């Protein structure tokens, strides 16, 4: 993703859950919906 990082204003870390590492193709099991919008400096994220 990235070579190096410059100054950082903010940093966040989250839960330990694991993700699907393998390449599989068939019925989509799950749906993840996201909305990304930045209003007034705020990066708002919504999901389901």
């Amino acid at each position, epitope marked *: 993703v990235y070579s190096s990082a410059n100054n950082c204003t903010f940093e966040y870390v989250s839960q330990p859950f694991l993700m699907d590492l*393998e*390449g*599989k*193709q*068939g*019925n*989509f099991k799950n749906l993840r919906e996201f909305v990304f919008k930045n209003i007034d400096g705020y990066f708002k994220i919504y999901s389901k």
Partner: antibody
Amino acid sequence: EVQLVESGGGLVQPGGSLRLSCAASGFTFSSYWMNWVRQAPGKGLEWVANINQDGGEKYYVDSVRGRFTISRDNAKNSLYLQMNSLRAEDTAVYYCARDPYDLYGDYGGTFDYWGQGTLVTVSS
Amino acid sequence: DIQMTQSPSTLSASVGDRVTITCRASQSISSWLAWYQQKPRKAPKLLIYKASTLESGVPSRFSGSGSGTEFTLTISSLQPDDFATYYCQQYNSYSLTFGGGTKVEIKR
């Protein structure tokens, strides 16, 4: 001649396992998804399992999930389906068919080539 | 998931007549439907793909159309060879599903 010959059908008791195999010829086996569909006589045709061209991605119908594993040996040009914990219900004729690419999506062609079928009977 | 329901389950028509079997999906499959022909004990053969594209080598008598959720396979001039059960399938989403099957029989 694109051909698919299935082998391995037989009589099996409940709890038993079998592995059917389908030898393919006439096309580049490595490049295509292969599926196994079964027709159980009173009931209809049912889609059992599918494998991606790479062989990694594998999908199954819920009924079979722990029980059946589909696999393939490209060098061998063979596709296999190992079954476990056979139930009377699994009795059917199993056909190996060459599937289309899922990627095609809204334009899916369906299964172009089919084998003759292997009959497996599960009974005491 | 999606359920495909064909109708009629069985039909009898005379030779040369036009037969129309319909298939109805529980929800929009889009174009993802194909049709198969099956003879007794023989393995199924693919008639149509993408709802209306004829598979190579299949007779021109067979045609398939569809829009929305409802799709139809028509056989313009029924022939004696045509006796069989015809199935629709939707590849749109997993799991793949086939219709109940329509048995066609030659009326005499």
